[PDB]
Design a protein that fits this description.
part of a larger assembly, 4 chains, A alpha+beta, B mainly alpha, C alpha/beta, D mainly alpha, B: mainly alpha, two-stranded antiparallel ribbon, 2 strands, C: alpha/beta, 4-stranded mixed sheet, 10 strands, 45% helix, 10% strand, binds magnesium ion, PROP1-like PPR domain-containing protein (chain D), Ribosomal_Su5_D2-typ_SF (chain A), mRNA binding (chain A), ribonucleoprotein (chain A)
Chain lengths: 417, 168, 377, 180
């Protein structure tokens, strides 16, 4: 960082350097004849280089009026970065996760230099290989991109065009793969508290296995035991069952997926009648998607609307479909399906058209990653049957890959023909 | 940029900064100064760090995979041959660890907010600021309009397939 | 155009989910290969290798014949008209296709559902997988026509165990599918009636992995063991007699055993040997024994030199005489240019193996894309 | 180990038989057989002295039984045979390195990008070539470990003290059925 006293020092030095350059040029001119009418009254009073003097007079007056704390921070003017809202704990956990992996790496390289036997050296070399292939491994897609970038720096003309397009496609694919990989535990969250997760699941798994062996042994010794010892073993077995039930509860943590948006489609108050009156509960229908072809939905019922929405949010990542899109912006062909009495039409569109849909269809198509589709809901506009008809329609589209596999023939886009 | 001062004392400080801009000599000397050169170098490094969010260092490793491997081959060959019967070992370890740290360290998005920069419309407008005069020579771009609206919000109006560079 | 509608009928294409099959459908010539058929086959296989949506390829035959070899009547009529260019072009096209089959980047499977002769084995046996049936009969009767077992037949016969390659290339002996499994020339075996089952299984595999294809072919294949009367139970006779240095030594030793032991197999093998041209027997033995210690591009190179010498009628006209006697006049009694084995000299058989590229000529050599294909088989 | 040496003997006999028949043309075949036996006896004596390395690295003194041109031709034929074996084993390793799953997935990604034709084939052969280099460096490290282990074991003992030419072997679908 830079101290404010250092800033005052450098601005005073700059004003001084202006004065020194003015006097040095005045000296150089004045020694060689050369009257200084362009130095005096041309860099002092009648320069007016930016028209900044009224701004100086306005700022000078506003600096001698009020009192506060002179070193009090305030709200910034050119603030609102707005993408600076990411949870900082995950990011500051990434730092020391990488640091622990790097320290382990440095320890194995220092152990490789402390061996005495080449059998030991080979063993630590294989340990280093198994470490690097599991924690510092570069994905092969980045090797393809690096080779293509090597061809690109010396390419020109048509080859430069074609390589730029290919690397653009590759960069999109690797960014998507890194952001939405289900195997990376960094792509998961906790939801409100309803390799660390790996080891915290392994310890519970080993505890459950130990409790199951103990319970089997105690049931075995309960089968041949009669009397008060039988009752004491029964109480011991009940305590073991309680421990195992609590440990099984502790493994059920619902996870949300990062990079997904979840939206409410419908919150409804339903009712049931008893002799004491009406019993009123809430149902919530919600959809989720990652804007990259993955879409899901869930319906939940609870006592309040908030609780129903929360249960649906926990359930929404449990039924995810993958939807194929044409060129990441539209569907391959026109599709018409019906679910019960809800008829849905979808039409593909060129690339500057937009989305023409009602709110349920628009929300689902937006979350699946589409950009240019026209649609029409004909008949009943039940929102849940509309959701189901949208998922039925998007799974009945036959892509050119599908046609190519179904008919054993090559399918070509017509503009490449 | 590196002078994140409180409001009132920066407002008192701006008078001294405004006096330096009163003359052409002051603007010339501000341009040719080690202050703005340090600011420029820090902003260059800051712009370099933001590229790692796109996995830039992984592309750098993918370009240079063979020689990065050859460093490890050299280290293993030396630590086999000159050990089967130490500044070389320390030098090779320092180099390999420096390379592994430079190629494997994840992107670090700091707390400090990014400074918002003025855009120049050089894709379709050619300007000579001396007179000033300008000539239109091309068409505008949908991704270069300098609005402060996020992409996910504005996609509800544009419906653009972003990432190809085209006006789509 | 419209004139190529017959060639597209002669080489059909059947497409499956991730695989293509080439079908030979020339029933007049028993699926004999012509120059446009080889050109179409080469175009198809090049396009299918380039296509990343195709996992593996197939080669089948329609009818009771898989492939009866090359169509030599057109070459005979071309040689009769003076110019030798048509035979040349047919030969480098055929050897180029065989080289493509030997170096092919995707898995290739051949279904051998009938008689396979000559270059019919040459387009299929260099492949990765080979399926033999109970109708599969493999023979190499090139010496009895006045020609040599070309199209890579000096590559895979020379690599059989013992000296069985020499026996097959000199006698023209029939091999069955079980025996072809035993010799290692066929990878898998299934009955003819069970081929729709394997063909439906193979068609809708969506795998690139050769291990998955091998496991599927073995799982749907049939388990067979060679019979007691098989050729391979007489392999020690082959190594005893056909391992001699020259052809006349083999004939003399077999004649001596026929005089002493009266072996019926020896009499039948003599009746097999005596029906061949004396020149091509020696060229065949030399090329079989030379091809044991060299790669496929080299084998196809000197096979091209032998073919291009045999069609120019430089030292003999046994090619045209054998073709005429056994295909045109059909009296089946040819008269070779040397009637006897002893008339054939060392200088005559060295004219077939000479570096014709040293005669200030370029198209007398076989071109092969060894730099682009970067051979690995 | 018998297969490699037997292939070397077969290639060497096949070349040197023609070389001897060209060299001494007037002599009969039995003299050629005897000289081939003497030549192969001297070559296997060289191999049993110091392996295949000294047959291709630096020429020793010639034996007085043969001439200097004969030993030079034998040396060049041995070099040619070992180079043919090196090329053949390299191609047989490329057979399984082209189809290796890392190269297969890199080629899958490259073809999914749009890289086809000759550029894809070139990149496939390249990636197989760096995999071959990595595995041969690994094998050289393994061989060096073995040799240093054996020599250190032998040095520490002093401190710790005080092809049938045509036999069938039937195998179908990876199931060896050679038993009687
Ligand atoms: Mg209505």
């Amino acid at each position: 960082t830079i101290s404010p006293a250092e800033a005052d020092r450098v601005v005073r030095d700059l004003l001084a350097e202006v004065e020194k350059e003015k006097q040095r040029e005045r000296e150089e001119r004045q020694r060689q004849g050369l009257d200084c009418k362009d130095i005096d009254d041309e860099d002092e009073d009648e320069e007016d280089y930016l028209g900044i003097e009224p701004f100086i007079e306005k700022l000078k007056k506003q600096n001698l009026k009020d009192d506060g704390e002179l070193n009090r921070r305030e709200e910034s003017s050119d603030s609102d970065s707005e993408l600076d809202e990411v949870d900082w704990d995950e990011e500051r956990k990434k730092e020391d996760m990488f640091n622990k992996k790097f320290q382990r790496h440095k320890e194995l390289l220092q152990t490789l230099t402390k061996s005495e036997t080449l059998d030991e050296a080979y063993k630590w070399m294989t340990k280093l290989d198994k470490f690097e292939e599991k924690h510092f491994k570069l994905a092969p897609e980045y090797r393809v991109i690096g080779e293509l970038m090597n061809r690109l720096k010396v390419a020109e003309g048509k080859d430069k065009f074609i390589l730029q397009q290919k690397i653009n496609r590759a960069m999109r694919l690797v960014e998507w793969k890194e952001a939405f990989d289900p195997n990376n535990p960094a792509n998961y969250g906790v939801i409100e508290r309803d390799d660390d997760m790996k080891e915290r699941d392994d310890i519970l798994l080993e505890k459950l296995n130990a409790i199951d062996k103990k319970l089997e042994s105690k049931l075995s010794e309960l089968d041949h035991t009669f009397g008060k010892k039988g009752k004491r073993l029964e109480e011991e077995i009940r305590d073991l069952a309680e421990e195992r039930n609590a440990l099984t509860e502790k493994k059920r943590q619902p996870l949300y997926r990062k990079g997904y948006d979840v939206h409410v489609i419908d919150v409804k108050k339903v009712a049931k009648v008893t002799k004491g009156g009406r019993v009123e509960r809430y149902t919530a229908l919600m959809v989720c998607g990652n804007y990259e072809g993955v879409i899901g939905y869930a319906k939940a019922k609870a006592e309040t609307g908030q609780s129903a929405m929360q249960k649906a949010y926990e359930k929404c990542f449990q039924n995810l479909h993958y939807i194929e899109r044409h060129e990441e912006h539209t569907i391959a062909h026109a599709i018409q399906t019906s679910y019960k009495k809800t008829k849905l039409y979808l039409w593909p569109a060129p690339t500057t058209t937009g989305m023409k849909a009602g709110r349920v269809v628009k929300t689902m198509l937006l979350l699946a990653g589409f950009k240019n589709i026209k649609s029409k809901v004909i008949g009943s506009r039940n929102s849940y049957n509309t959701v189901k008809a949208v998922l039925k329609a998007l799974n009945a589209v036959e892509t050119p890959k599908d046609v190519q596999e179904k008919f054993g023939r090559t399918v070509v886009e017509k503009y490449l023909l | 940029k590196l002078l994140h001062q409180p409001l009132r004392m920066w407002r008192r400080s701006k008078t001294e900064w405004f006096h330096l801009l009163k003359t052409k000599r002051g603007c010339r000397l501000l341009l040719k100064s080690r202050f703005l050169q340090q600011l420029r170098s820090s902003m260059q490094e800051e712009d370099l760090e933001r590229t790692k969010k796109f996995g830039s260092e992984k592309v750098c490793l993918g370009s240079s995979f063979a020689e990065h491997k050859r460093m490890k081959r050299n280290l293993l060959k030396s630590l086999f041959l000159s050990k089967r019967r130490p500044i070389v070992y320390n030098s090779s370890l320092s180099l390999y660890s420096n390379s592994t740290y430079c190629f494997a360290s994840p992107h670090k998005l700091t707390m400090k907010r990014r400074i918002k920069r003025i855009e120049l419309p050089t894709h379709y407008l050619e300007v000579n600021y001396r007179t000033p005069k300008a000539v239109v020579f091309y068409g505008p771009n949908i991704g270069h309009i300098p609005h402060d609206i996020r992409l996910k919000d504005l996609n509800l109006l544009l419906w653009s397939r972003n990432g190809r560079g085209q006006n789509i | 155009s419209a004139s190529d509608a017959d060639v597209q009928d002669q080489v059909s294409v059947e497409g499956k989910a991730k695989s293509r099959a080439a079908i030979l459908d020339r029933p007049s010539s028993l699926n004999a290969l012509s120059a446009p058929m080889v050109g179409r086959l080469k175009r198809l296989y090049e396009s299918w290798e380039e296509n990343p949506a195709i996992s593996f390829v197939l080669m089948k035959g329609s009818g009771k014949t898989f492939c009866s070899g090359a169509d030599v009547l057109p070459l005979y009529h071309s040689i009769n008209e003076g110019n030798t260019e048509e035979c040349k072009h047919f030969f480098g096209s055929l050897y180029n296709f065989v080289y493509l089959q030997g170096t092919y980047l995707k898995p290739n499977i051949a279904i051998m559902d009938g008689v396979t002769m000559g270059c019919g084995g040459g387009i299929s046996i260099p492949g990765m997988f080979r399926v033999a049936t109970d109708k599969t009969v493999l023979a190499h009767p090139e010496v009895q026509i006045g020609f040599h077992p070309d199209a890579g037949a000096s590559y895979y016969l020379s690599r059989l165990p013992g000296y069985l390659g020499e026996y097959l290339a000199l006698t023209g002996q029939k091999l069955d599918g079980v025996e072809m499994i035993a010799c290692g020339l066929a990878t898998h075996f299934c009955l003819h009636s069970r081929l729709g089952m394997v063909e439906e299984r193979i068609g809708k595999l969506l795998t690139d992995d050769p291990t998955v294809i091998e496991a599927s072919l073995a799982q749907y294949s049939d388990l067979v063991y060679p019979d007691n009367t098989s050729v391979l139970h007489k392999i020690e006779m082959i190594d005893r007699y056909f391992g001699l240095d020259t052809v006349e030594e083999i004939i003399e030793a077999m004649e001596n055993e026929v005089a002493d032991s009266g072996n019926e197999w020896c009499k039948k093998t003599l009746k097999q040997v005596k029906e061949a041209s004396p020149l091509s027997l020696k060229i065949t033995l030399q090329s079989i024994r030379e091809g044991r210690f060299q790669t496929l591009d080299q084998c196809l190179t000197r096979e091209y030199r032998i073919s291009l010498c045999g069609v120019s009628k430089t030292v003999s006209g046994d090619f045209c005489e054998g073709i005429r006697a056994r295909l045109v006049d059909k009296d089946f009694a040819p008269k070779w240019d040397p009637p006897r084995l002893e008339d054939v000299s060392k200088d005559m058989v060295d004219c077939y193996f000479s570096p014709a590229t040293d005669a200030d000529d370029s198209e007398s050599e076989l071109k092969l894309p060894t730099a682009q294909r970067e051979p690995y088989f | 180990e018998d297969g490699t040496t037997n292939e070397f003997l077969s290639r060497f006999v096949w070349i040197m038989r023609g070389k001897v028949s060209e060299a001494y043309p007037d002599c009969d075949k039995k003299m050629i057989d005897g000289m081939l036996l003497l030549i192969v006896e001297k070559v296997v004596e060289e191999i049993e002295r110091g392996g295949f390395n000294k047959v291709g690295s630096a020429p020793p003194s010639p034996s007085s039984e043969f001439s200097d041109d004969l030993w030079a031709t034998i040396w060049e034929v041995s070099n040619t045979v070992l180079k043919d074996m090196e090329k053949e084993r390299k191609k047989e390793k490329m057979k399984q390195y082209v189809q290796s799953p890392e190269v297969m997935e890199m080629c899958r990604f490259a073809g999914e990008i749009g890289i086809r034709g000759d550029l894809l084939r070139e990149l496939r052969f390249k990636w197989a070539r760096e995999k071959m280099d990595d595995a041969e460096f690994y094998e050289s490290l393994e061989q060096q470990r073995d040799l240093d282990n054996s020599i250190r074991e032998s040095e520490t003992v002093d401190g710790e003290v005080e092809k049938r030419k045509g036999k069938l072997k039937y195998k179908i679908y990876g199931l060896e059925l050679s038993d009687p």
